[PDB]
Amino acid sequence: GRQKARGAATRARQKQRASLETMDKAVQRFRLQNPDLDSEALLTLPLLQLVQKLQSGELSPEAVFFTYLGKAWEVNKGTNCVTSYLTDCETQLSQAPRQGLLYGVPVSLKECFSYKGHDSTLGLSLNEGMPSESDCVVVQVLKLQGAVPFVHTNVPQSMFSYDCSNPLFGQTMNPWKSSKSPGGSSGGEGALIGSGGSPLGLGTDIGGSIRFPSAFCGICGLKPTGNRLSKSGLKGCVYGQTAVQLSLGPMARDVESLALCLKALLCEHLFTLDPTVPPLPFREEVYRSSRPLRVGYYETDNYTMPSPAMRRALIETKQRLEAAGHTLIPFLPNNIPYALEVLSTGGLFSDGGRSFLQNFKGDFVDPCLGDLILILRLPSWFKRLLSLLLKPLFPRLAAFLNNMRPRSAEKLWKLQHEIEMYRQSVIAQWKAMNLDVLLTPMLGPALDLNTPGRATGAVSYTMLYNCLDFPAGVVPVTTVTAEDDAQMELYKGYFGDIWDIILKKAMKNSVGLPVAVQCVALPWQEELCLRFMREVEQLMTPQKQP
Amino acid sequence: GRQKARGAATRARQKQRASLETMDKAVQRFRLQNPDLDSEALLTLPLLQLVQKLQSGELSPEAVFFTYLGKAWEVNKGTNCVTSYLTDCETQLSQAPRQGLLYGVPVSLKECFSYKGHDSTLGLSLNEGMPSESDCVVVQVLKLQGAVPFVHTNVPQSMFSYDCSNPLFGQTMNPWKSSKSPGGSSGGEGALIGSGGSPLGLGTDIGGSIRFPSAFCGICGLKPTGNRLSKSGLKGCVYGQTAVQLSLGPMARDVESLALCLKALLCEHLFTLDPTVPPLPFREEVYRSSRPLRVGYYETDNYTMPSPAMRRALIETKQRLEAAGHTLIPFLPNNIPYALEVLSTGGLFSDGGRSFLQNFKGDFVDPCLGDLILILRLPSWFKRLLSLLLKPLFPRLAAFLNNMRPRSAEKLWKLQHEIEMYRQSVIAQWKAMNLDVLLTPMLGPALDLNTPGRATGAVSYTMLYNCLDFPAGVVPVTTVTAEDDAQMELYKGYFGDIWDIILKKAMKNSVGLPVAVQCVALPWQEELCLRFMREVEQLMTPQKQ
Ligand SMILES: *[C@](=O)([C][C]C1=[C][C]=C(C2=[C][C]=[C][C]=[C]2)[C]=[C]1)C1=N[C]=C(C2=NC(C([O])=O)=[C][C]=[C]2)O1
Ligand SMILES: *[C@](=O)([C][C]C1=[C][C]=C(C2=[C][C]=[C][C]=[C]2)[C]=[C]1)C1=N[C]=C(C2=NC(C([O])=O)=[C][C]=[C]2)O1
Ligand SMILES: CCCCCCCCCCCCO
Ligand SMILES: [Cl-]
């Protein structure tokens, strides 16, 4: 009963292979004509510098484009992050608006950013051979700003996962260690940007999907307020779920690139192409501010025990923020377990997962999804009974299961109102301490391939901020030491359930992997959040290229 | 079992009575100290000039406040629009921030704008004797801008109505004609502002509730995009419904007053007090633009037959815009019957009315609600059966009834997605004609008392824009002539169902009543919408500017 799904996989792998072949040919031809180009100097230029030399005419767009193309092709060899070469991008190159803020910049796109003539499969059989009629809005805006979107990058099947494998294009690997997940669902971006194959990409995030891959692969990512940027024309898999909104945002090698991307997207072109997005221009004066901050912080959410490296990462950042004159205030949003188990999970699965499951009918289920599909398929009464049996021993498992049940419109209204009140509760708590921003641990180091799907509880650090719909970003601040890695051996977790047990095993053998912290500000405060992310980057990686 | 509802009404009426008495004494006390005050001239100043005089010192806040207070008390005699005098507002008056953009302006509040120490009953027994414990955010911002909120005004019971009666405070009457509804649910505001008792107020709107009372009473009103202004701290009766967007906004005697109010609300105070609102400052330059406009228009929505006065109002306004060099382009949002019957109604009533109905347990149901409560109370199977029976002769009634049935979360997601797709579809139409703004009929003239609850169909002109969540304001442009009124005898409606029959009768006997047009722009374009409203006001009623 999988013939259709096998045929879709066969055609998708053939398209991926042919894309890669096309990229290689274009690259080899370019290198023939240009044997004297210093490609290493060009590839190691920070985006802002890259942009400046593209604008001044010191670098040609062709040079930058084919140099990134070959790098992307090369890093793909060991990561399998690229699903499709966006075909006509060479012609887009020659027609790029010369005064665009991203003129001549190659940009990589997560597969869900619809690009005319191309599938956005999400790794799902039912989406194969359905090429988009047109570019999504953000892609249009990138082009109107002179950028050159050039590849679609891999995502885990359906995107509802923080790993990164699907039955069409297979598994994407972390560039730091191939037995490690790159994170997800923007895992292709994480792996590609993290190994130098792209200077800028866009991802999406409903529970951490920009933040996980950024942290796991050692790059910067920002998830803005859900409606800060346009979602018009994006390929999705669940429609009309609005309790927990999806957010899209940039990933890149440094904080300044995230700021440039946001500044480029937040222009009249975006606001007129999608009038539903509030026309809030990028406030540069807020981003470039350098006043002392009141910084709320916590070392642990009391839900996911942090790895020793996560905890050290957080504490060292707190300490340097304090040495730099900031005020560090202990702070923890109230009722995190409610936010995760009841509001987030309830919001995401208000219908018991039926709408989500339509996607999987007649399809393989990628091992990286774990038992998610099997669990969602259980009848409501059975989820209920099983939840009751589990409650005494494993309350966390029980609480998630009970909240993944279908319910009436009436109860959805009640849930939406609760999400709304919880958001005001945390806003009030934040204002009572007069915080400017909030510093939190970020999940890391990277988990073994195919383990994120068995360690659901670990979305706690990021998913809290989709529930709250606050802008939240991540910045790499350290790498796992031998001592961090040895101490991980005593890791117990707060619950001792299967999620805690998997997390300890999945983080084994991590010496050298990047570890991040998370930076949060209030709704619509992307500029302040980025200002704070820049501060953490200046202090924790003082040797990063200007 | 009605002892509780009766008790609630007795207490509410005694409170209202004590408030009016407190106002009377304050007013008389002031008048004795100020015998030479030209009250008429003060009451007549357009708000803009009033603000300017208060800021310079030419007028004292006390003179402005007590003069409006006496006017409010006088006009309430014949309208019953005031439910409560906001007690401490006299102290607020002496403390108003001197540089506030609304320094010394008295502001009237629809009863649902929570105000510390005061009930927001919504005309419901279960809310009586349960005072708010804090000002809602917009009241806070008004006060931080130096304004003096001074009264709560009446609403129809629960607010789900475009009439204005409840069993607690009773019935509000149109100030132009006592047999007429002032509209609603922001009806107390329309009646108070429209009779000169308040220079500025705030209403709310989920299907027209700012626009109905504005049109019916002859004043200007704006329903912004749902999340342009903070709803934080408002009193409601249905919580968590997000398919069809609730909006709050200003009502006033002229367009400039709405623009001033928005400019004062859209400040740092608002944006820090409620970070969930996008911090979009009022773009003065967009509001002040005098560039020619591409104005889409329609003179009927093919759902509610416009009255002859509505029709003429629309066409005359169209012709004056053409004469002033604007480009008038025929435009009708696609699939209106679907947007109204499936999306809007299904959105408002996704749970079959069960949450709404909880508010009425143990309470009288005001006659102005008509059969709404009785209908919502019916078992889903029976709504469905009755819908089948009506379908062949009365498709509209059948459609509303079927779409007011409860459903699963899964069905609500599907509806939400359809709403989102529908909104993009109208945006796409608008883009393909390169419109700046859209001009539509506004329901009018005012309906007879106790008939809006029996003519649900007539919400079509306004509710479409809550569904789409576009900013939409109305501007008075003409008044009903005997000619317009006699032509009501030829009005048939497009459907001939009970709604069309009720509406035909209810709109008669309206000679001399105000009639408006509606002005619409794209989401977040309140300033452009106001720019257009200003244009209409200037071309049809030059005296306002
Ligand atoms: C990522 O943010 C997904 C990360 C993630 C979120 C939630 C869970 C989870 C929570 C509770 C129980 C089981 C699993 C695990 C991992 C991301 N990126 C996109 C999406 C997403 N997009 C759509 C859409 O339609 O565009 C729908 C669902 C998810 O999630
Ligand atoms: C007004 O906009 C009410 C005008 C109105 C809207 C809809 C209907 C209707 C539609 C279909 C079937 C039956 C009736 C009739 C009149 C207004 N102002 C506030 C509200 C409102 N507020 C809340 C809340 O909780 O704040 C809830 C419901 C309605 O409606
Ligand atoms: C929950 C605490 C507030 C209850 C006090 C009395 C109720 C006043 C209602 C006005 C505010 C609407 O949310
Ligand atoms: Cl919004």
XYZ file of N, CA and C and ligand atoms in Angstrom, chain A residues 227 245 276 278 524, chain B residues 227 276 278 524, ligand 4:
28
model
N 3.558 37.404 13.456
C 3.053 38.184 12.331
C 3.942 39.390 11.989
N 0.925 30.327 16.738
C 1.231 30.749 15.371
C 2.636 30.387 14.971
N -1.863 42.129 5.378
C -2.182 41.580 6.706
C -1.029 41.688 7.719
N 1.423 43.933 9.843
C 1.548 45.328 10.280
C 2.823 45.968 9.699
N 6.846 42.135 19.179
C 7.185 43.254 18.293
C 8.522 43.886 18.652
N -6.537 44.513 15.746
C -5.449 44.657 16.710
C -4.644 45.989 16.587
N 1.242 43.443 23.181
C 0.663 42.610 22.118
C 0.141 43.415 20.909
N 0.815 45.900 17.843
C 1.969 46.380 17.067
C 2.126 47.879 17.243
N -4.475 47.720 8.532
C -3.458 48.624 9.084
C -3.413 50.004 8.399
Cl -1.271 41.248 14.502
